[PDB]
Design a protein around this ligand. Structure first.
Ligand SMILES: Nc1ncnc2c1ncn2[C@@H]1O[C@H](COP(=O)(O)OP(=O)(O)OP(=O)(O)O)[C@@H](O)[C@H]1O
Ligand SMILES: c1cc(-c2cnn3cc(-c4ccc(OCCN5CCCCC5)cc4)cnc23)ccn1
Ligand SMILES: Nc1ncnc2c1ncn2[C@@H]1O[C@H](COP(=O)(O)OP(=O)(O)O)[C@@H](O)[C@H]1O
Ligand SMILES: Nc1ncnc2c1ncn2[C@@H]1O[C@H](COP(=O)(O)O)[C@@H](O)[C@H]1O
Ligand SMILES: OC[C@H]1O[C@H](O[C@H]2[C@H](O)[C@@H](O)[C@@H](O)O[C@@H]2CO)[C@H](O)[C@@H](O)[C@@H]1O
Lengths: 367, 380, 300, 93, 228, 120, 211
């Protein structure tokens, strides 16, 4: 008879705890906030058994594979409730024409640099080793980010023309995968050559790169808007700018749209829907989350009209408009760890570029 | 659809744990059958150390009638295990295809199934979900047990899954509520497989499923006149619903029908510049710590049993000579014993070359043939 | 033309071709084929005249080509252990392998000459045939074309030396130019085994996607896989198969078409290599010239 | 042996007498044989198929080895008129 | 329906051979190893014997090695613990327990004891059966102000261990304190049993202890009387 | 020779809170147990609380079970008594004790020094 | 071949307790836990110290930390008052633990001291035994001593303590000191002195001869 929220540990869970305390103040039902590790793997094993969390906060890339198993409930939005949000945010959560999730916010990657160590941000990906040749003599590093996950390495690969699935008319083609073209080969070759020529460290993940950026060990980093509280905590003179162009072509990041998933096995569907539609997507509910950790471009236009004065969020929206929206097909669930295994095999030197891209092309849609 | 160097194809069969698919090697074309387990369906624990213990445990179980496991490929979405592939299909499909079978082939399948189940029992593992749909045939008409330990996941969850998931093949103890199922279930399932081999039809088969459980609880079963009474006495001793009177491996091995045509290999236990160059310390002869007259008598007995013609100038100087059977010429050599110390004595071999005759064959290879038959007789 | 080398090979016999000391192996026919190539690893030699104890005659030859044939035929998978190499013997494998071609052990007397031996090496398509003395019957030495060129190069200091050595390489049609067999570095060992079984080639110079030669792969490099017991894993790339000796060699001995033949022969006999590839300024493969074609040009 | 002049020209396996009164020890072997059996030359700086010249004292003597697997290593350094050969023969037991 | 019924227990002479059985009903003895344990009064469990009929291998503790021969009969599903040359220390209750050595899961090799028997009690003593002697315990005449006086009865030099005691005040009792039996140095047993009662009731009420010993056929009563 | 000294306590208001301390040195403190006693004027000595060696048990009397809280420290070699919900009739002298039983859980109680905790 | 050594403690209803089991040598995860009620059979709770045996619910839980096997009992029901045993079977000789007992929490009560003179019926038989009595004392741990004629005599005293009450949870001790008839000439007065945890000053009762 309560609400259980699972969200990733790098998100603003204390704002959700404050909204749950306000809900307990208004009606008496408490909200329990938990942050489990690898929640996209822990979710279906309890959702199939009829127990676990009642509501999940995750992007729409896993929601197609969640909906094909009958694990997500059908939502009933109002006309004014659709009018308050952006139309492409409703389009990104469409599964076979049906709406399955409430849009929350739009997350997009941007270039975050240290103004004290680098006053002018580079406009070219190829001059980053030329800058690192100067910066290694100073004792710093040019660019350090999470290499274990493909979400951060995807723009450097897909800048020259790489794509996950071909989108023509409402359907993603599972046989047209653009990881075997020349642009993905050049991007993965440059990503290997950054490691082999001692410009980056292959064992660098999100935590080590975050601790290096809060201590000022790196000059640039690639990270999302959720780490802005940790950036403000370390008091480093930070700047957020547009991602640079690669061979005359800009980067193509995944455009992430955070959504609210409702479990189909939960008897508390109506209370959760009233909770979301009355508290979370309002002007007062977003500020409690934004005070903890900023989410970026929100789906509510009224709060975005006041929020758009931040040039960081403006550059995030510019990178989102020059980016690419994620597919919501269930073949993305096989795409993610296949591209992750390809990046791990290419970075560690166990496999070559062509073998890893052939494994990514073969194991793209199915496995 | 790509694991290791194997692409995947169609689906071989349907399993409650996971779907079994066929894989093909892209270069050689060898067929490897991989079982694919869905992690989202069943996962007790997410600790990688238990996966490491599983990899350490399951690979070391090698048996000529148990399907060998090659490796366990980890995956965030599924669980892959690459087993070997057979081209004969399931036993139950063979029964449905050919009906009644000969007794001499049913006993040959039953001995191999029992030699695999006893191997699993000696390695402390049981197959609770045993049925003719979980045993396979090769091209050479043998028997291969598919999953020896994978039924433990079905036993770990609940006993109601065993009764509801497998209504036809379920032990009387499990449907009577015994939480832990031992080798008696293996003996009962092997008796059901033996009855299926001997008769083709199922022993307990009802349209109404609680009537089927009641008939499994009932001891009585139909007996045709095709089979001689010794093996139906074995089936009555083996298919008792109470585990105190149910047969063991020793109780099957002491039976008369089981000992008629028994291969010896079924039971392992009888009681019930560029290249590297390595130097070698070569030995001249044979170092024997015995009396030299006794060694001379031993060599004389050996060359007598090898049918040699020999003459002695000295007692220690033995010039032996043999005529080859297929080669018309004869070969000549000479033996001499050496005293390196008072304890041991060294026997040395010395050939003499052919002076004037262009003899056929090879002189030195026949010299090695005059000693390769002698060292085997001496064995010292 | 060839009147100074043909009379040389007819006057100077094969009796001078045998060195002073020579290690020589023979294998029993009832021996398993698994231990025979391990013994060839231990002794280092690449050839072994077989002996049949049931017939008392030299029955055949077991070499690296037979190693390629058995590891191409009786090889199922890398994960599957190779039981056939363990269980088969020499007689059991040769009764299957010699079903279509019945080829006895060809040899030559040491009292004969060198011209007939070179013509039999060229005609019989045999790299290593031994000699058998008719008076004795035993075998003495396993002849190699490398030893033939080392014997020939010492005796070229005479007056009719520029008969055709001064000429070029492109105009004399020396070497195979019509068909070339190449493998990429990413290609596994097994496709090179298939090319070795299908064609009668002896080496595969590896190239990149452009065609530049960076390494070289030959049949002698196969036996180290059996030496380090990695003969069951034949699905790895040829780069990891050529990293076995990466601490020792320098590169690939390339030659050119415009260079004279005698300089190619001198660099061939100096570096004790069997064959060289021809390249250009763009470093593409135009063909391979081996000993069996240079001696073919010399014997005519 | 036709060329030999033995004390006993019989050459028959049946006519064997081990009851000889003489108890004299066998003749001691020369030190060169001890040297060649103790150390066998295995050259490593040159090619593995190249060996130094064998001594004149031992020509027709067998050289066996121990048994790891069921093979039987045995060799002899046979002598031609001028050339020196060494025939390694490997045979299963 | 698994019950491990023991038999053959009771009382033995020291230096005599005893053979207790374990009728394993409900499972088969050929696959599972029957393990015997020792439970001394006051102490914990102690493993003594083992037999595994599937491979024909036995096991023994270090203190009972080569003296307590174990036997298993697969035809009647019994386990025979033939003990020989027993000492005075081995006086305990012997439980029978089956043992499950199989893999219940893929990762966990189960090596526990599932089903336990009731266990029979063997008593080793050189002394024979002796009649119980009860002595009237005497409360002190002096007492504190507003303090209850406890009364009891003392039983000494009796055999065997089970004792049933009763009082003459009523079938129900309040403030009863029944002590466990202690083994003194003379091989026999001792017993105390006191009752907590108010001091004011002692003048009116009268108490008589009833000592009941069924295998000794001694039913003697002893009237407690306050006397200095 | 052993040393024993208390600290804390004084003229405090009833119903509030007050902490007491007790410490010793010169010997091993982990293998021995500490206890607290009360001696009312005109009455005999009464038991208050005890603390085990490594925190196995916290035992109290019938009247101070749900009011007093005893604790001990291993780094500063002191103990603590958190007195909550005090009564005006429980004013008495409070003692500390040293158990001299080694390798056993038995208690040999002796009071070296005690302070006068008088509530108002 | 090796030995085991658990701890010993006591807590209230619903408290979270733990029981260690320090293995001597290096052992695997083959440690069980047996709950034995007094006068009953030892019930199995957890078989390999990490996963629950079927039957008894999830209140019992165990963790493995090297060679320090733990047994944690969260939400202690008022029926789970029995003796717990560690059990190591990985080596091959089965070795049990010392056995830990869980006692219910009770307020400390002052013991009652009773002295009893020997009756005249056992004086004529030659075997007379004096006994002192302890009633309603908590904790169980107590130390009695016989300073007879100001002389601490040990070796002849034997104690027999009973279990706790179902409704009162109180213990009762009985220390029987046996003597003879000829040993009464030397010792005129006898004293049974007890040192209890809740007793501040050790008090004894002495009865003079000839009353
Ligand atoms: N043209 C070449 N360029 C570079 N390396 C070569 C060339 N030819 C041969 N090699 C190297 O020499 C090594 C052995 O030579 P090869 O494979 O020709 O057998 P070989 O030594 O001629 O045999 P044998 O000595 O029995 O005739 C091989 O590892 C190969 O890499
Ligand atoms: C369970 C089973 C297997 C497995 C391994 N090999 N294999 C093979 C099959 C199989 C299934 C169907 C087959 O077709 C039946 C018809 N063929 C062709 C005509 C003659 C009879 C046999 C043949 C083989 C099914 N399962 C397996 C692997 C893992 N777990
Ligand atoms: N002297 C010989 N007589 C008969 N057959 C031979 C002889 N030498 C080699 N062969 C056969 O010819 C085949 C090709 O051998 P080849 O490739 O010349 O050996 P290598 O690989 O050592 O050069 C081998 O399979 C072998 O059986
Ligand atoms: N990989 C190859 N490609 C083309 N021709 C080859 C190759 N290897 C050997 N040859 C030819 O085969 C003949 C014999 O060479 P060999 O086998 O080295 O004695 C010569 O004509 C070579 O040019
Ligand atoms: O490829 C890794 C991972 O990327 C994305 O996960 C993001 C998520 O969208 C953000 O909200 C935040 O949690 O950072 C995550 C990466 O650490 C994809 O959504 C996800 O499917 C994918 O596995």
């Amino acid at each position: 008879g309560k609400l259980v929220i699972w969200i990733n540990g790098d998100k603003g869970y204390n704002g959700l705890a404050e909204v749950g305390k306000k809900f307990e103040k208004d009606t008496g039902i408490k909200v329990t906030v938990e942050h489990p590790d690898k929640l996209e793997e822990k979710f279906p094993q309890v959702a199939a058994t009829g127990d676990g969390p009642d509501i999940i906060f995750w992007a729409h890339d896993r929601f197609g594979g969640y909906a094909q198993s009958g694990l997500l409930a059908e939502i009933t939005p109002a006309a004014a409730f659709q009018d308050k949000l952006y139309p492409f945010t409703w389009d990104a959560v469409r599964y076979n024409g049906k709406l399955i999730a409430y849009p929350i916010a739009v997350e997009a990657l941007s270039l975050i640099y240290n103004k004290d160590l680098l006053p002018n941000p580079p406009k070219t990906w190829e001059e980053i080793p030329a800058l690192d040749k100067e910066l290694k003599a100073k004792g710093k590093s040019a660019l350090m980010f999470n290499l274990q996950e493909p979400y951060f390495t995807w723009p450097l690969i897909a800048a020259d023309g790489g794509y996950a699935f071909k989108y023509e008319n409402g359907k993603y083609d599972i046989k047209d995968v653009g990881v075997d073209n020349a642009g993905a080969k050049a991007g993965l070759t440059f990503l290997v050559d950054l490691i082999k020529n001692k410009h980056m460290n292959a064992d660098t993940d999100y935590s080590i790169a975050e601790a290096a950026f809060n201590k000022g060990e790196t000059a640039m980093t690639i990270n999302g808007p959720w780490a802005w509280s940790n950036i403000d905590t370390s008091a480093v003179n930070y700047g957020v700018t547009v991602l640079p162009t690669f061979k005359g072509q800009p980067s193509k990041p995944f455009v992430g749209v955070l959504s609210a998933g409702i479990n189909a096995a939960s008897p508390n569907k109506e209370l959760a829907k009233e909770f979301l539609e009355n508290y979370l997507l309002t002007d007062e509910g977003l500020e409690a989350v934004n005070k903890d950790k900023p989410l970026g471009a929100v789906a509510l236009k009224s709060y975005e009209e006041e929020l758009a004065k931040d040039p960081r969020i403006a550059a995030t929206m510019e990178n989102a408009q020059k980016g690419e929206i994620m597919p919501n097909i269930p073949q993305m669930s096989a795409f993610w760890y296949a591209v992750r295994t390809a990046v791990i095999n290419a970075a560690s030197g166990r496999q070559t570029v062509d073998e890893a891209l052939k494994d990514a092309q073969t194991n793209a849609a199915e496995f | 659809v790509k694991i290791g160097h194997y692409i995947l194809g169609d689906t071989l069969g349907v399993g409650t744990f996971g779907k079994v698919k066929v894989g093909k090697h892209e270069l050689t074309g060898h067929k490897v059958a991989v079982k694919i387990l869905n992690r989202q369906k069943i996962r007790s624990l997410d600790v990688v150390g238990k996966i490491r213990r599983e990899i350490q445990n399951l690979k070391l179980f090698r048996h000529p009638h148990i399907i060998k496991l090659y490796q366990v490929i980890s995956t965030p979405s599924d669980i892959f295990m690459v087993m070997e592939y057979v081209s004969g299909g399931e036993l139950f499909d063979y029964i449905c295809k050919n009906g009644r079978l000969d007794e001499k082939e049913s006993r040959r399948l039953f001995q191999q199934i029992l030699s695999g189940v006893d191997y699993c029992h000696r390695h402390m593992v049981v197959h609770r979900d045993l049925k003719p749909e979980n045993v396979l045939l090769d091209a050479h008409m043998n028997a291969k047990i598919a999953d020896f330990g994978l039924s433990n996941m079905m036993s770990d969850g609940e006993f109601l899954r065993t009764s509801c998931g497998s209504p036809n093949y379920a032990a009387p103890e499990v449907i009577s509520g015994r939480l832990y199922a031992g080798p008696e279930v293996d003996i009962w399932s092997s008796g059901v497989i033996l009855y299926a081999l001997l008769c083709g039809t199922l022993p307990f088969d009802d349209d109404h499923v609680p009537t089927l459980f009641k008939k499994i609880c009932d001891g009585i079963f139909y007996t045709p006149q095709y089979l001689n009474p010794s093996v139906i006495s074995l089936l009555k001793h083996m298919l008792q619903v109470d585990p105190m009177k149910r047969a063991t491996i020793k109780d099957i091995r002491e039976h008369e029908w089981f000992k008629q045509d028994l291969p010896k290999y079924l039971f392992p236990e009888d009681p019930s510049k560029h290249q590297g160059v390595r130097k070698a310390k070569w030995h001249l002869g044979i170092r024997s710590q015995s009396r030299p007259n006794d060694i001379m008598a031993e060599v004389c007995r050996a060359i007598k049993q090898l049918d040699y013609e020999w003459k002695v100038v000295n007692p220690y100087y033995l010039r032996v000579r043999r005529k080859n059977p297929v080669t018309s010429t004869y070969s000549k050599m000479s033996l001499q014993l050496y005293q390196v110390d008072s304890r041991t004595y060294l026997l040395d071999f010395r050939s003499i070359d052919d002076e004037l005759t262009p003899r056929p064959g090879s002189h030195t290879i026949e010299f090695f043939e005059m000693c390769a038959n002698l060292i085997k007789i001496l064995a010292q | 033309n060839n009147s100074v080398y043909t009379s040389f090979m007819k006057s100077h016999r094969c009796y001078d071709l045998i060195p002073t000391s020579s290690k020589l192996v023979v294998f029993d026919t009832s021996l398993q084929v698994k231990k025979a190539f391990f013994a060839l690893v231990t002794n280092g030699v690449r050839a072994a005249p077989l002996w049949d104890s049931k017939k008392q005659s030299f029955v055949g030859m077991l070499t690296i080509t037979d190693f390629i044939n058995i590891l191409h035929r009786y090889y199922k998978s890398a994960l599957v252990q190779i039981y056939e190499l363990e269980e088969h013997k020499i007689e059991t494998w040769r009764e299957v392998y010699l079903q279509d071609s019945f080829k006895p052990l060809v040899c030559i007397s040491p009292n004969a000459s060198l011209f007939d031996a070179v013509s039999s090496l060229i005609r019989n398509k045999i790299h290593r045939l031994p000699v058998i003395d008719p008076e004795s019957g035993n075998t003495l030495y396993i002849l190699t074309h490398k030893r033939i060129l080392k014997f020939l190069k010492l005796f070229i200091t005479e007056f009719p030396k520029p008969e055709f050595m001064s000429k070029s390489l492109e105009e004399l049609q020396i070497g195979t130019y019509a068909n070339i067999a190449m493998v990429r570095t990413t290609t596994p060992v097994y496709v090179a085994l298939g090319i070795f079984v299908q064609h009668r080639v002896s080496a595969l110079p590896v190239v990149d996607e452009k065609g530049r030669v960076v390494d070289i792969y030959s049949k002698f490099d196969v036996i180290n896989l059996a030496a380090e017991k990695t003969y069951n894993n034949l699905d790895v790339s040829v780069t990891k198969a050529l990293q076995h000796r990466s601490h020792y060699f320098e590169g690939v001995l390339k030659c050119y078409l415009h260079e004279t033949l005698e300089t190619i022969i001198n660099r061939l006999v100096e570096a004790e290599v069997h064959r060289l590839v021809v390249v250009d300024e763009n470093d593409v493969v135009k063909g391979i010239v081996s000993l069996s074609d240079i001696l073919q040009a010399l014997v005519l | 042996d036709l060329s030999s002049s033995p004390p006993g020209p019989y050459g028959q396996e049946m006519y064997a007498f081990r009851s000889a009164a003489r108890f004299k020890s066998p003749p001691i072997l020369p030190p060169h044989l001890l040297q060649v059996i103790l150390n066998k030359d295995t050259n490593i700086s040159c090619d593995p198929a190249l060996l130094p010249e064998p001594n004149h004292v031992m020509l027709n003597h067998l050289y066996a080895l121990s048994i790891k697997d069921s093979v039987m290593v045995l060799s002899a350094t046979h002598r031609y008129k001028k050339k020196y050969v060494t025939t390694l023969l490997y045979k299963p037991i | 329906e698994v019950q491990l019924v023991e038999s053959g227990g009771g009382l033995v002479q020291p230096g005599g051979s005893l053979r207790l059985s374990c009728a394993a009903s409900g499972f088969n003895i050929y696959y599972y190893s029957i393990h015997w344990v020792r439970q001394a009064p006051g102490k914990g469990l102690e493993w003594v014997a083992s037999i595994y009929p599937y491979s024909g291998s036995t096991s023994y503790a270090d203190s009972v090695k080569g003296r307590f021969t174990i036997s298993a009969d697969t035809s009647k599903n019994t386990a025979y613990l033939q003990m020989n040359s027993l000492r005075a220390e081995d006086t305990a209750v012997y439980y029978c327990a089956r043992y499950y050595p199989y893999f219940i899961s893929y990762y966990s090799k189960m090596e526990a004891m599932d089903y336990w028997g009731q266990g029979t009690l063997v008593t080793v003593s050189s002394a024979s059966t002796k009649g119980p002697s009860v002595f009237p315990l005497a409360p002190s005449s002096k007492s504190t102000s507003g303090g209850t006086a406890a009364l009891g009865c003392l039983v000494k030099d009796y055999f065997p261990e089970p004792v049933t005691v009763s009082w003459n005040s009523g079938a129900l009792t309040s403030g009863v304190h029944t002590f466990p039996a202690v083994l003194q140095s003379s091989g026999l047993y001792s017993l105390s049993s006191v009752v907590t009662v108010p001091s004011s009731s002692l003048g009116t009420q009268t108490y008589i202890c009833n000592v009941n010993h069924k295998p000794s056929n001694t039913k003697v009563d002893k009237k407690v009387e306050p006397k200095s | 020779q052993v040393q024993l000294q208390e600290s804390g306590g004084g003229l405090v208001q009833p119903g509030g809170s007050l902490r007491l301390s007790c410490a010793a040195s010169g010997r091993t403190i982990s293998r021995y147990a500490m206890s607290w006693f009360r001696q009312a004027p005109g009455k005999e000595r009464e038991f208050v609380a005890v603390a085990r060696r490594s925190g196995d048990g916290a035992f109290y009397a019938d009247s101070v079970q749900g009011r007093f809280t005893v604790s001990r420290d291993d780094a500063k070699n002191t103990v603590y008594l958190q007195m909550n919900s005090l009564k005006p009739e429980d004013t008495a002298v409070y003692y500390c004790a040293i158990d001299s039983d080694t390798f056993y859980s038995g208690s040999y109680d002796y009071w070296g020094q005690g302070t006068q905790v008088t509530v108002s | 071949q090796m030995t085991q050594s658990p701890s010993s403690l006591s807590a209230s209803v619903g408290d979270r307790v733990t029981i260690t089991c320090r293995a001597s040598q290096s052992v695997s995860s083959a440690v069980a836990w047996y709950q034995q009620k007094p006068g009953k059979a030892p019930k199995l709770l957890i078989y390999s110290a990490s996963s629950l045996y079927s039957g008894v619910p999830s209140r019992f839980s165990g963790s493995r930390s090297g060679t320090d096997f733990t047994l944690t009992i969260s939400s202690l029901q008022p029926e789970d008052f029995a003796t717990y045993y560690c059990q190591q079977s990985s080596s091959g000789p089965i070795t049990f633990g010392q056995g830990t007992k869980v006692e219910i929490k009770r307020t400390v009560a002052a013991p009652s001291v009773f002295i009893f003179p020997p009756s005249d019926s056992q004086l004529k038989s030659g075997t007379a035994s004096v006994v002192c009595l302890l009633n309603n004392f908590y904790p169980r741990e107590a130390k009695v001593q016989w300073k007879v004629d100001n002389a601490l005599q040990s070796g002849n005293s034997q104690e027999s303590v009973t279990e706790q009450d179902s409704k009162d949870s109180t213990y009762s001790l009985s220390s029987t000191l046996t003597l003879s008839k000829a040993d009464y000439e030397k010792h005129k007065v006898y004293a049974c002195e007890v040192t209890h945890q809740g007793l501040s000053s050790p008090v004894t009762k002495s009865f003079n001869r000839g009353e």
